[PDB]
Structure formats: C-alpha cells, structure tokens
Subunit: 336 residues, 5 copies
C-alpha cells in the first residue's frame, strides 16, 4: 500500500531534468506567490533595517510531474525539493537573509495529479527600509519588500499575486507586535524594470507603519518641558539675588544642550532637522531668552529701576503664555 | 557477534524510503514529545528574546523498522538519523535556532523490536517572549515555546505530550539560573490552528517567570529616595540663604531628570508608562514642589514674613510624611 | 521539444574539464566585467568599512561550449555553474564577503552558440575604505574596490571593463542612499602589479563620496557656538558679582571640555587634529579667555578701578566681533 | 615502500562499520580523556561566560583496527576521522562551541598495532560559568567544564581521566593570561547522573580563579575615598559661609550617587548586594552625614552658638577617624 | 592540444592517496613557508586581539606528482586542492580564523615537472596579542603569529622560512594602515616544543608596533592640563570670595575624577597602573592641593591675616612652576 507511492516518485524523477524550467520554449512559466508573516520583527531605526519572518510560498504548473494514483496529493519535505526545478527567487532589499534548518529544513513540497506544484519556504529577512524622518516622531513609514527571479527574465518567468491583496499577504495576530510601531495594513504591487540582462518583473509588498508616541514624551519632551518651567521660576526671584538667578539660567541652558545630544543618540545620524529638533530648539530659546532677560534687567537695575521691575513682572506672564501657545500649535500641527 | 548487527541495519535500509512518513494512507502518525531543559539562558529584556538549551526528544512508531535479534534495542548516533524519515518539527517563535556539532552532532537514534523509534536532538533557541511591562518591575512573565510540523497537517502527524506535565518538561537543577528572574514553574498545552495549507497542531510550553527585585532598588529607587530626602534639607535652612537653598532645588530636580533617562536605558523602548515610571514621576514632584515652596516663601518674605515662617516650618513635617505614606501605598499595592 | 535541450547540455559536459581554463596554451583568456550596484550600504566611519551589494558579472569566450540548436541562448541557474570552469575572482580590500543563498543561490549562467559565457553573481562586500580626515567634516572620500584573479597571472587571464565607465558600473536610483554621504560619481581603472607569484592585473572601481553636513552642526557646532555666547554674557554683569560671573566661566569651560570628548566618540581614533577639532579649540579659547578677563579685572578692581571698567566695557564688543569674524574665515575656508 | 600503507588502510576499512561502537555486546567501551589548554580566553562577567581553547583528546581500544606491518604507528589526519567510529562527546555547559577549519580541520588520528586509537580535536568553547558575587571583588570563582557522551549510557561508554590530575589537564604557560583573574589551579572529577534515557557518566573539570584587585581600586574605591575626604573639608569652613559649605555637601552626595550607577554598569545585574556595594553605601553615609551636620549646625547657630562651634570642631576629628577605622575593618575582613 | 593536460592530471591522481604524506618512511618532509600581508587589520585593545589578512603560502616536494609534458608548470585552482595531500597547518594564537569563498575559494595549486608543489591560501586571522601596558601610551607592542602542523611531529614535517626574513614576510604598502599604531618592522623565528604527543616545530612571526600618540593628548592629557590651569585661577581671587573660589576647587576635582573614569573606558581593564594613570593622579593632586590651600588660608585669615596673604601670593608662583616642571620630566622620561 506504501510501495505504490515509491514507484510514482521514481517514475517522475526518471528522465526529469531540474536545470530546465517547465514549459521551456513552449510558453511562459507563471508563478503565484502568497506570503504569511509569522512575526514582524523589530524595526531598527539607526541602521534603517527591519527583521521579518515569513512563510514564503510559490505555486506553478509543471506537466512533467503529472501522475495517476489513488491519492490526489503527495505531501513531501525538503528531501525532494532539490531534485526538481524551482524558481530562483531573491529579495532585492534583503541585506542578509538566512533560512531555518532546525529541527529540519523548513520546506514543503505538494504535487497534484494535474502537475500543479506548491513550494513554501521559511525565511528571515533583514531588509532595509529607508525612512524620511521629516515629521519624526509624528511620521508614517512604508517599508517595502521587493523580490523576483534572478536568472529568468519577464519573458520566461512571471510572478503574480493570488486572489486579492488580503489573501496574498497574511499577518499573524501575535506576529504584529512592535514596541514603537503600529502595523496599520499591507499592500502589494507589480512592475517591470529594464536592465542590461533583460526585463525582470518585480513583486513589491508594502507595510504601513504608524509610529506610536509616548516613549519620546517620557524621554525627550517632558524633560524639556519641565526644564523650561524651571527657568521661568527665576522670574519670581528678587533682582538683587544675582547668584540665585544665575544658577537657573546656566543650569537650564546646559540641561537642554545635553538633552539634544542624548535625544539624537538613538535617532539615526540624518543630515536634516526633524520635528522634535525644532521643539528642542524652541525650548532652548525660552530658557536662553530668560537668562538674557535677567542679564538685561540686572544691567539697568541701577539707572532706571522703575522699568526693570515692570519688565520682570511682565516676564512672569508673557513667558508661560508663549510656551503654552507654542505647544498647542506644535501638537495640533502634527497631530492632525 | 558484531556482524549480526550490521546485517540487521542493512536489511532495514533495504527498500526503505525516507521521503514517506510511516503508516502513510493507512492511519495517522502519532508523535510523543518530551523536553529536557539543560539550561535556561539569559532573558534579554531590550530585544524581547530569551535563550534556552533543551534536549528535544520525539517518539513515534514505524512498522518498517521492525526487526528480530538477540538485542532488544539498537543504540546509534547521527549517522543513521538522515537515512530514515523524521518529523519536520520547527519552532514558530524561534527567531534563530542553531544546533551543536561538536564534538559530534548531538543526535541519538534508538530502535526497538516492535519498531518504536526514539529521536532526540540538542537545540539552542533564541525565541521571542513578548512582555507586558505594566507592573514592571513587579511583573510576572509567561514566555511560551511553540513548535509543530512544517509539512504534515493535523490529519497526518499529531504531537502529544507524554504522561503528565511534570514528565513532559524537565529542568535541570543548575539550569534554571537567571540573574533577574525566578523559574516558578512550567506548563504545556495543545491547540489546532486553521491555515490556507490546512490545519496544523501546535504544541506550546509556557515558563512562569517571577522577576526578582533588588537590582532596581539599588539602581533606581534608592538614588531617587535619597534625592528626595536631600531636597527636604532645604526646608531647614534660613529663608535669607537664597543661594544656598537654590542649589538644593536645582540640583535635585536635574538629578531626578537624569535618573529617569538612565533608568529607561536598559528598559525596552515601550510606548507606555510603567510602575517604576510613576514612582519616579512622584519623586520628581516632591523635589520640584520643594523648589516651588521656596520660591513662594521667598516671594512673600517681605510683605508678610509671619506667614512665610509658618509655611516653612509646616513644610518640614508635611513633606516627609507624604513621601513616607506614598511609599507604603506604592510598595503594598504591588507587593501583594 | 524539451528533450533537445537535455541532450545539448549532456554533450557539452561530455569530455569537458572544469579544472582547465578555456584556450589553455593557445591564447590568453579575456574577461569582461560589468557591475551593477543594488544598494550602497552604510559607510561605517569608526571601523573604516563600507557595505556594498552588487551584481558582479563576468563574460568570457569558451570554444568548448559551442553548440547548435533552435534556441540561440541557454538560460540556466547555479546548478550548472560548478560543472564548468569559472574565474577565481576575489576582492583584495574585502575584509569579509558573503553570498546570498535564499531563496536560491543567486547565480545565472547564459551560453550562446558561439560559446560566449555570461556569469553573474550577487555579493555583499564589507570592504575597507581608509579615509584621511584632515578636512573632516568638510572632506571628500574616494573609496576604491579592488578585485582580480587569485591563481591566473596577467599572462593567462586579463580583466577589462566593458564599453565606457558609465556602462561598466551602474548604480540603482534608490541604491545610493546614505545618511551622511553623497554618491557624486564612480570611476574605474586598471593596473598591473608584480609579485613573487607573477604579475596579476588589478581592476579598481572608485566611488566619489561627498559628506553632507548638518548632523554635526546640530550635534557639535551649535552647542559650542551657543556655549561661547553664554560665556560672553558674564561681560554684562557687575564686577562685584564675583560669584555670579564665576559660574559662567567655570560652567562654560567644562561644557566645552565634555563636548570635545563626546564629539570624538563617534569619530575614529585618529592620531591627528581635524578641522572640527580646531574649531572646538578656538571656541575653548574664547570661553577660557573670558574667564581670564574676569579674573584680571577682579584683580585690579581695587587699585585702579578706572581701567577695570574700561576693559569690561571693551570686552563686550571685542569678543563678539572676533568670534563672528573667525566663523566667516572658518566656514569660507572649507566651504570653497 | 609507500604502497604498503595504502593496502593496510584499505583492509581496515573493508567490512568496518562506523555506526557500531567497538566491543558491542561483548564488553563496555573505555575512553581515556586528556586535555591541553592552548589559551584560557577572557572571562566575561556580564554574560557569565568564558572562552577557552583546548586540544581535547580521547583514547580507546578497537580490535577491528588491528594490523601488522613494519611501522608501529599510523599518523593520519581528518580524512580518515569520519570513516571510523568516534565517541559522541559533547559539552553540557557549552552554550556555543565551534571548531577550527583553517588551514585544515585540526584533527589527528593515530593507530597502533594492538588497535589502540588516539583522536584529538581542537575546540573553542563559550561555556557558562555562574558566579556568586557575594564577596565581589574579593571573590574566588570555580568555573567547571562538563562533558560526556550524548547517545551511549554509562553501561556502554565510560570516560575516565588518564593518570593523575596534573597529567589529565595541562595549561600552556602563556595560555593562562587574564586581565582580571589568576588561574590558581585545576581539578577534575567524575560522577553519574540518572535520566529518563539512562545513566550517563559526567566528566567535570574545575578551574580555580582568583580575581586580581587593582582595577576597581583605581575605578571605584579611590574616587569614593577622595570624595569622602572632599566632604570633610567643609568642616574647616566658617558656619556663616552657608553657600560655600552647601556646594561640598550637594556635589559630594551627587558624585557618590553617579559612582554607584557607573560602578555597576560593568557588574552583572545581580539582585543582591555585593561587598563593594556596602563600601559605597558606607561612603555615601559619611558624605550625607556631613551635610546633615552642617544643616543641624546652621539651624542652631543663632540660638546656642556655643554648642554649634563645639560640634563643628569635634566633627573635624571624629569623621576622619571613623572613615579610616572602617577601611581597616573592611579591607582586613575580606583580605584574610 | 588541451586534452594532453587532462590525461596528465588523471595519471597523477591514479594510485595517489591523499591520506599519506610524501616521502613517508623514507625521509622527513620539508615545507617552505612564505607570507604576504594583504592588510594589517585594526588592533583592538580591549579584547587584546588584532585582525590580519595574509596570503599564506606553502611549498613542498612530492615525487608522486612528477610528470613530463610540453608545459613546465600546471596552474590550477581549489578543485584539485582537496584531491592531494596538504599539510595540516594551524595557528596557535588564532582565536577564530575564517577563509574567503567569494567569488571562488581563494586557493592556488602549481606543480612542476620535478614534483615541487606550491599551495597558497588566503586567511583572515583574529589572533590574540597580549600587551604589557606599563608604559602606555608610550609603549611598544610585539604581536606574534604562531603556526605549525597539527598531526605531523617535528620528526615528519618541518617548517622553515624561505631565504631571508625580508622575503619570508611581505607587507603591502597600503596594507599597513592603523589608526593608532605604526608597523615598524617584522621578524621571524623557529623553535621546538615537547608535548605528550611529540615534538612539534613552531613558526613564529613578530610584528613591531609603535603606538602613535596624539589621540590621547586631545582626549585625556589636554583636558587634564587645562583643568589644572583652571584651578590655579582661584589663587588670583580675593580670600573673602569664599563662594567663588569654592566652585573652582570642587568643580575641578570632580572634573578630574570623571576624566579618569572616562579615560579607562577604552583602555583594557588591566589590574595595574599605567603611565597615563600616574599623570592623571599627579594632576588630581594639584587641583586637590589647591583646594586644600584655599581651605587652610581661609582657616587662618582671621587670626593671622599677614601669613595668609603671603601664602596666597606664593601659591600663584609655586604651583605653575611645579606643574610645568613635572611635565618636562614626565614627557622626557618616556619620550626617550
Ligand atoms: C542588473 C543586475 C543583474 C545582473 C547583473 O549582473 O547585471 C550586471 N544579472 C542578472 C540579473 N537578474 C536580475 C533580476 C532583477 O529583478 C528581479 C534585477 O532587478 C534589480 C536585476 C537583475 C540582474
Ligand atoms: C501558513 C504558513 C504556512 C505555509 C505557507 O507558506 O503559507 C502561505 N506553508 C506551510 C505551513 N505549515 C505550517 C504549519 C504550522 O503549524 C505547525 C503553521 O502555523 C503557524 C503554519 C504553517 C505553514
Ligand atoms: C602575493 C600574494 C599572492 C600569493 C601568495 O601567497 O604570495 C606569497 N599567492 C597567489 C596570489 N595571487 C595573487 C593575485 C593578486 O592580484 C590579483 C595579488 O595582488 C595583491 C596577489 C596574489 C597572490
Ligand atoms: C536528559 C537529556 C537527554 C536526552 C533527552 O532528550 O531527554 C529528554 N536524550 C539523550 C541524552 N543523552 C544524555 C547524556 C547526558 O550526559 C552525558 C545527559 O546529561 C545531562 C543528558 C542526556 C540526554
Ligand atoms: C598538546 C596539544 C596537542 C594535542 C592534544 O590533544 O594533546 C593533549 N594533540 C595533537 C597536537 N599537535 C600539536 C602541535 C603543536 O605544535 C604545532 C602543539 O603546540 C602547541 C600542540 C599539539 C597537539
Ligand atoms: C510587464 O510586462 C508584461 C508583459 O506581458 C505586461 O503584461 C505587464 O502589463 C507589464 N507590467 C507593467 C507594470 O508595465
Ligand atoms: C484538534 O484536532 C483533533 C482532530 O482529531 C481533535 O481530536 C482535537 O480535539 C483538536 N484539538 C482542539 C484543541 O480542538
Ligand atoms: C599590463 O600588462 C599588459 C600586458 O599585455 C599590458 O598590455 C598593459 O598595458 C599593462 N598595463 C599597465 C597599466 O601597465
Ligand atoms: C558510576 O557507575 C559506575 C558503574 O560501573 C561505577 O563503577 C562508579 O563507581 C559510579 N560512579 C559514581 C560516582 O557513583
Ligand atoms: C628542532 O629540532 C631539529 C631536529 O632536526 C633541529 O635540527 C633544530 O635545531 C631544533 N631547533 C631548536 C630551536 O632547537
């Protein structure tokens, strides 16, 4: 009852060459690709890379594997994977991709009577996801995933997604778990590119990422906000207390300076200003401006004390209002 | 006396195909899995990963390997492991799993007369353990371990634990040694999942982790507690000592700010507030509030000195009581 | 219709030795090399290394592979790559080069009737790019890429670029994306080197890198510039305020000291002064000089107060002018 | 003269099965293990791991390899290593072990006429060495090294050290070079463990490590000791100098706080107090106590100045004596 | 014309055993080793390791490979490398050595009529170079490179350098490029070592390294030198300015303390004092001594003001002279 299967496998491999694609010189091989995301790994920001584990699956028609028998399907494993022809799919943006070999090489091969072949592989891709951090941290990132044939041009092998976008890409409920991102959705697309070696079809899958705020608020914004409030306390101290008010201005300014350096340590070394950078710069101006006001007041406190008192009293009201007004514009501008 | 064993091995391999599972088209293959944990490696927090070394073992029945001879068992090694059929078990949450090949590939194969097969493999799994750090550091983590067949659906290969939970999973006495965790216990479970490729049984093992406190107390809590006490010292200084009391308020506030940044450097970049974060925030309020009290007292020390003295004297008693009362509620709330 | 291809492949491999180069003892093998840069990876500064992913391609003539058939080309994959002779090309500056094996080893083999062979391979090279950081960050780097045969001297195998430089090297539009560099252009060259094992031709490709400024301005220059301005504020304070002006001088000097240490943390540990280092040193002099002026003024404020006031008033004007004048010379000198 | 050796090798491999241990079903295989330590790699503290390179050697008797010829020994290399049976030795505590393959796989095989076999392998073991840092840095660590058979129980394969302990383990003169440890000596032992798969003999080698002090003295103790002395300087300042003495107390307390955090950055995140931690805590009390004394003195300097002067004068003598006395007890307690 | 070469190769491999060294039982195999350094990689200080890329070459005589033909040499590649016998050379100090496999395994095999064989291999060695940092950074390091046979004792295989030292080791002009070292020269040597497995010849190559100063001057010495000068500024301030002079003493002392910790972060954790450590300690004494002088002066400024003024005036001259004198002795002592 089991010996029948062995004979069928031997017959298919008899006279079968794995170096030639099915339907060579008679038609164009068609491949259907479906992807299942086991887990969307962490999205490293500094290196512009993200790790993803998927069960990449490919389906194609091969008449050379047609067979007749009591069983309509032939489940198998990696043993027969190398004995037949398979597409030379590769990932363009994958900087370093490795497979899983334990406990057994994670590969499956299913063959039907008509000759249809299903081949699925488990992969871990450390792809590169360039990001435009103009609105960081209020930025949305669209990490793509490009793959295609390495040796067969568009005239020989063509990749097409199966059914709609929802069925083409599937993400596990627990797979989409990122500490500082939200997986809003996924999309797919196809395109052709002309090269010196010929035209090759490109299959691209895009993941919509919505960065979640809250870590930077507790890390960068709140220390800056409290620091600005600390500087304004000097406005409530007497002018003659030159030493006391000096500490607030000097300490606050230096505190903001180190926060900017510390804040960008995790941020990628991008050569442009981000939204957070402007917020820090504005906060730096307030603390720096407060010190200038104290110096100006202390400079004229002897010649015209009357105006000095008025400026100090006014500063107690103007500064808090401007800082509060700026926050509403800043948060509203990006949070909308 | 030794040549008899060689003939038996040759006979079993004669006409045996490793590409077909035992009992194909006649029944459903049943596999019994037992696990022994050599050492529960460190549980990295930042990357949500933990390393575990186990002696994964699988048992199944194969009638094709039945034999008769003086010896009731056939101890072997990895040499014959690849010559026969083995399940394509894999770990779903294993981000990167590698085997041990030195001195020899750590694999054993034992066969009995009835045809029962025992196959054990040594593995090192860098699995992912998502954690909800809402009660951190007073949090309990349940790291799972999911594995199953890659090519054989539930209708062909089924995994079941052997005997009770205690025998299914065994942990070495010295294996469970973590610097900041306690291995309270282990549990196992089984479930079915429906996918496009069919239904596959899932075997999950859960490890109960109870984080041990003491490192964060010496690292985060104690510096914060002493810092708050330092600020309250200013209440015992004369009001006219404006400069002296200014240093305490400014220095203490900045000290708390850097502690919050330093504390979360090791903590994962989670976008929500933890229990420790609230404690730091409350401590920040006390030191910040003390500075406000000094500023308010110094503002009215000229118009109504009588009330200024009363506020300063009262602050010496109210502040220590509130800080002490808060600790009892905080520690009692989580330590219970 | 497909069986014809199988016979052709068998005939070519019949009597073909892959250990002997084509045209041995009759002529000199000629190889044409064309490169396509999929993505120019990050250029690490500390380790003097850069990562590049390219589709390295080689073309050569082999009369032993001549064939006649209906199809003028024979697209193939890695299966036949090892069955024939290929050049032993290697990268001299490549510290650690690894290939991509997923989903399939990225290799293509195309053969024409005349016997011309096209062989392309995907590689990731962690080459070393020594840099002379004399004008850093206003420095231009020319990272080379040297490769050649390992066993065949110039008298047997010769590498030559195909057509012009533009066609020889091609860079993808999205491939050239660096956080702190601009890919101005590419150039190629050839040379011979004499060694104990014979003369070997060297193929070198140079990439022109123009570092983009803006990250260091927000990281190093701006904190230094503001720090210098902070020190000059002390010139507007009264001389008798010894304590108040002391804080500015001491704090500013220490702030510059830590910036220099922090600035070079990312910079490679080079044993020479860079352009940025001189800017920091000059800024350090201004803040340090301001403290000296205060000390000198405070030393003679009792004997000859008249001159002390004049020096303090003059310092308020001289110092800002010199710092501003220095910036124009510094920026103009390098930004030109 | 050389052809004789070839015939002998062919004869031994004729009818020899490498899947069966020598003396199967007739006796118990005995293996003698001798180890040579090429270099005891660094002992990482944070990860509780140490790297060691050894020339692991195993000797056993195999009657199937008996031969007669002019030469009494048959030096060989890795080529014949896989053609015969070898023990499946593995390291229990080895988290990740890799071999050396350059220039050639470092393996030797020597066979004598009687059939004795010598098999040595070079290995690099990243074993785990749990440490109890109760007396750190005055702590002695005993890193073990456990290995044994993976498939052959104690009833089939037994490991025994050769001759005495000195000959069993040999360490190169230059191999034992650690930056913060001393290799006092080595010891060996054997034991049996009962498991579900049977009883397996365990071979354990223990290395005696005596941590060398001097790095922490220049890194942690000395900064703390000088900081405490700095605080005591305030006792020599006038009481009315409230601001001057405030800086010493505040700055010293914060300096100790950062030292404790910095000190434990390299130390493993252990959830218990070490000997160094107590020393830091005691030093923190002295600096903190000095600030309290100043605050208490300044609080009563108006009502009863007479007692205030006495306390300040007494503090100048009591504090240095207590700090010096504590050091003698602390150093003597552990350095003995 | 090409078929002649194929026959010659087949004849040599006919009856040739790669498991037996040439001239076995008739003489002692002699191997000549020549090394070419493609690039001397970075010399990591913390891990006591350095990376080097070399074209290791070995030459030996094999009569079994004698042939007669029109061509006097047989250039080849890695294909035939494994088909013949090669020495089992290995590196003793190599902690982790890996080869280069792209584009092709970098191996060459050349055979002459007399039977001489040339075999060269490209290797990347992460060898260990212990360093005695007693005179750091004015220290000279001699990193060795030990290699030899793994299975053939001195009585069978002997390694000898070819010609003089200059020809034995060759370093590329651009290869010797280190950020903090100078490759003064190279030397070679041979020695015998007796072991339990027999006597094995050892080939050692030593590289003379002269650390280049300038990075530490801008990183450690200059901040310390300026800090000491900053402390001496307090000597020019009035005694009554207790608060002003307190800041200089406290801030400078703490600044030196953090520099010592920061300086040794890159330095290896060696348990002994280096030359730089003494310089920092001396600088610490000057700043600390200045604070003591101020405290002593302020203590007696009321009882005997006359002596207090003299001490302060004298300190302005003595301190700068001693610091300058110390530098001349320190720099001259090591820079000579
Ligand atoms: C142009 C690079 C290249 C080369 C080569 O070496 O060219 C010099 N050889 C074969 C190739 N197959 C490709 C398939 C592709 O799309 C799926 C593709 O898209 C980026 C590029 C190539 C490709
Ligand atoms: C759905 C992913 C998948 C695919 C594939 O490529 O689907 C597009 N192929 C074969 C597969 N065998 C599985 C067994 C499983 O459980 C043990 C399992 O659970 C997560 C998933 C798969 C699986
Ligand atoms: C001199 C190093 C060397 C050796 C060797 O071991 O020499 C002792 N053997 C074979 C070699 N083929 C080379 C080809 C080259 O250029 C493409 C080359 O350029 C740096 C060097 C070598 C080379
Ligand atoms: C109990 C783990 C185990 C298993 C397995 O999978 O058990 C479920 N299989 C085969 C085994 N051979 C061993 C030899 C040993 O000592 C040298 C040993 O000691 C820790 C354990 C095993 C072992
Ligand atoms: C003593 C270690 C050893 C062993 C072994 O396992 O001994 C227990 N076996 C074979 C060996 N061949 C060696 C060649 C050497 O020099 C080139 C050498 O020098 C350090 C050591 C060995 C060596
Ligand atoms: C790519 O080429 C194929 C050729 O059949 C064509 O059908 C398809 O529309 C092309 N795709 C695009 C995006 O142009
Ligand atoms: C999974 O499927 C099998 C089919 O035999 C069934 O016996 C078992 O109860 C199912 N498990 C669950 C959790 O539903
Ligand atoms: C290298 O050698 C070849 C020998 O044919 C010669 O044609 C070529 O001009 C040489 N190249 C250089 C740069 O000298
Ligand atoms: C282990 O078992 C063997 C069985 O022969 C016995 O000889 C030996 O004494 C046992 N060792 C220990 C430590 O019990
Ligand atoms: C090593 O042994 C050989 C044996 O022939 C001898 O010639 C050589 O001088 C010895 N080398 C040393 C350094 O003793």
């Amino acid at each position: 009852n089991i010996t029948i299967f062995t004979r069928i496998l031997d017959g298919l491999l008899d006279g079968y060459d794995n170096r030639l694609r099915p339907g060579l010189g008679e038609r164009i091989t068609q491949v259907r690709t479906d992807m299942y995301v086991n887990s969307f790994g962490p999205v490293s920001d500094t290196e512009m890379e993200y790790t993803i584990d998927i069960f990449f699956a490919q389906t194609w028609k091969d008449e050379r594997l047609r067979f007749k028998g009591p069983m309509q399907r032939l489940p198998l494993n990696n043993l027969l994977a190398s004995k037949i022809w398979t597409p030379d799919t590769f990932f363009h943006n994958g900087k370093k991709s490795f497979a899983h070999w334990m406990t057994t090489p994670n590969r499956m091969l299913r063959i039907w009577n008509d000759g249809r072949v299903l081949y699925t592989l488990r992969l871990t891709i450390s792809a590169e996801c360039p990001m435009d951090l103009e609105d960081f941290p209020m930025d949305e990132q669209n990490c793509p995933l490009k793959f295609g044939s390495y040796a067969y041009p568009n005239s020989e092998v063509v990749y097409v997604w199966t059914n709609g976008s929802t069925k083409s890409v599937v993400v596990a409920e627990d797979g989409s778990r990122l500490n500082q991102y939200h997986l809003m959705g996924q999309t797919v697309g196809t395109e052709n590119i002309s090269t010196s070696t010929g035209e090759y079809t490109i299959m691209t899958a895009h993941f919509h990422l919505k960065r979640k705020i809250g870590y930077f608020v507790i890390q960068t914004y709140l220390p800056c906000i409290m620091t600005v409030i600390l500087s304004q306390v000097s406005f409530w101290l007497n002018r003659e207390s030159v030493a006391a008010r000096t500490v607030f201005g000097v300490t606050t300014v230096l505190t903001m300076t180190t926060l900017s350096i510390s804040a960008r340590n995790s941020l990628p070394k991008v050569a442009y200003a981000t939204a957070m950078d402007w917020f820090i710069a504005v906060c730096y101006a307030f603390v720096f401006s407060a010190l200038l006001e104290f110096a100006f007041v202390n400079y004229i406190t002897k010649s015209q004390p009357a105006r000095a008192a008025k400026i100090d009293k006014m500063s107690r009201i103007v500064f808090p209002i401007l800082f509060g007004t700026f926050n509403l514009v800043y948060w509203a501008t990006y949070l909308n």
